Amino acid sequence: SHEFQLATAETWPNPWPMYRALRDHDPVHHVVPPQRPEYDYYVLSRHADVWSAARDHQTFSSAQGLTVNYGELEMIGLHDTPPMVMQDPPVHTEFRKLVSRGFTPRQVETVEPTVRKFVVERLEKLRANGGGDIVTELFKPLPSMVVAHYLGVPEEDWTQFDGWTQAIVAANAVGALDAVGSMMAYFTGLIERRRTEPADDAISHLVAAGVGADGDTAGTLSILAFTFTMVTGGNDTVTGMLGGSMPLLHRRPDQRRLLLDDPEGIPDAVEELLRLTSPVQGLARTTTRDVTIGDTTIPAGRRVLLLYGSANRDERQYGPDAAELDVTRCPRNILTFSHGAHHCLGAAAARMQCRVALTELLARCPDFEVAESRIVWSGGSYVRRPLSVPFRVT
Numbered sequence: 001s002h003e004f005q006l007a008t009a010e011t012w013p014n015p016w017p018m019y020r021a022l023r024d025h026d027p028v029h030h031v032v033p034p035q036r037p038e039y040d041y042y043v044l045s046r047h048a049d050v051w052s053a054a055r056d057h058q059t060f061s062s063a064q065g066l067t068v069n070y071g072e073l074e075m076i077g078l079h080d081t082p083p084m085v086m087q088d089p090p091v092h093t094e095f096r097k098l099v100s101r102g103f104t105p106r107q108v109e110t111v112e113p114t115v116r117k118f119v120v121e122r123l124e125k126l127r128a129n130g131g132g133d134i135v136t137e138l139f140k141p142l143p144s145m146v147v148a149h150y151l152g153v154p155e156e157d158w159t160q161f162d163g164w165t166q167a168i169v170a171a172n173a174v175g176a177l178d179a180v181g182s183m184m185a186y187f188t189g190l191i192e193r194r195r196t197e198p199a200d201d202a203i204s205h206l207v208a209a210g211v212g213a214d215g216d217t218a219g220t221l222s223i224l225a226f227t228f229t230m231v232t233g234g235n236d237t238v239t240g241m242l243g244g245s246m247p248l249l250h251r252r253p254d255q256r257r258l259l260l261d262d263p264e265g266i267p268d269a270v271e272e273l274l275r276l277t278s279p280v281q282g283l284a285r286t287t288t289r290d291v292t293i294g295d296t297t298i299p300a301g302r303r304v305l306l307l308y309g310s311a312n313r314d315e316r317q318y319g320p321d322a323a324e325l326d327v328t329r330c331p332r333n334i335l336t337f338s339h340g341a342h343h344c345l346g347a348a349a350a351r352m353q354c355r356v357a358l359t360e361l362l363a364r365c366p367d368f369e370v371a372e373s374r375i376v377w378s379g380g381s382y383v384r385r386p387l388s389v390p391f392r393v394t
């Protein structure tokens, strides 16, 4: 089908033609749900439009939620203490500044050897077995460790934390109350510990900066909400980037050759992979005012879906071969991590995981096969990530 529809597991394999029909025939597309016309919204599919809308937080607000579903915020119950991804400046600004102190090059550097060790352990197990599900065996568990590092969770608690994490990620995709409470109990304790035993992580930095201090319960709640932002945004996305890259590389032995002969091209290749997999394929904003883009006016008070996945595939920005893998492209201004105030804090961490995974895959498992038609995609309309990638190595 080329007709716009929110994605499902069944339609994640090939959304590209429908994006292309939008970009070409209706770049400011009005969706009026036949069974709910009251809940009409707009969809932006071109790079220029998505890039500007993402930046323009004044016109395009995150404060009412990030889906196309009106009433999202009250329905999930996030009004009183909304996460940072659903705050606009100026409210968003100070917290972002404080938590950013936990997202510097040092933090990505300190976890990289741990990432590499794990990737190696799992890839070697897979090789010995002649393959297995690279998602289950590696692409799922890996990002949970990195989120744990950024939250300053002691390594000894990573297994318990990964349990809560997998429950939450599953419940959140398309429901995890024990996990939510375990996590909220664990972090209440960790926060208290960081008051006297601070490290260089985001939670420590927030505590050291006084968030939650002196009976400031709102401050403490905001740290808890942040842990949820980290778990719900830092796992499934990475798994989509890693798993989604597998078919792309498999079908292009010429592109793998480029990197096998020149492993220094791997960082640029990671950017091209982030462009094409765009794990966050779309997120919404709410207009705060009428805005006209070309011949269409979007009324104030409507949701607008920013199709990052389409923007990243826009021939107007990347040329008529936008749909193809070119590891030497060095694509600029990709939308994979958004743009503006909310630009992904975990961008460097995600890039590092991709670089390490790709590097080791090519060194350890270069003769590998993936059956694309056997990949199973997660449900949910915003993030594209596989639940299973059947993987064989010779």
Ligand code: HEM
Binding pocket: 062, 066, 084, 085, 086, 096, 143, 146, 147, 150, 229, 230, 233, 234, 235, 237, 238, 241, 278, 279, 280, 283, 336, 337, 338, 341, 342, 343, 344, 345, 346, 347, 349, 350
């Ligand atoms: C390839 C994987 C990832 C992708 C595609 C991704 C994408 C994004 C996007 C699109 C946003 C902004 C959402 C919006 O437009 O409203 C965002 C925000 C955020 N991401 Fe990621 N992300 C990834 C990995 C991670 C990781 C690993 C972490 C943690 C280590 C992380 C932490 C965050 C945080 C804390 C925010 C909120 C920033 C703010 O609202 O100011 N992300 N991410």
Ligand SMILES: Cc1cccc(-n2cnc3cc(N)ccc32)c1
Binding pocket: 081, 082, 083, 172, 221, 224, 225, 226, 228, 229, 232
């Ligand atoms: C205190 C608290 C409790 C429960 C959930 C959250 N929470 C914060 N950001 C969230 C994002 C998603 N997608 C889901 C739940 C979230 C926060």
Ligand SMILES: Cc1cccc(-n2cnc3cc(N)ccc32)c1
Binding pocket: 066, 083, 085, 228, 229, 232, 233, 234, 237, 280, 283, 344, 346, 382
């Ligand atoms: C808390 C919340 C609520 C709703 C959507 C998202 N969301 C969508 N793409 C995301 C990517 C990251 N890294 C983090 C959150 C994301 C997050």
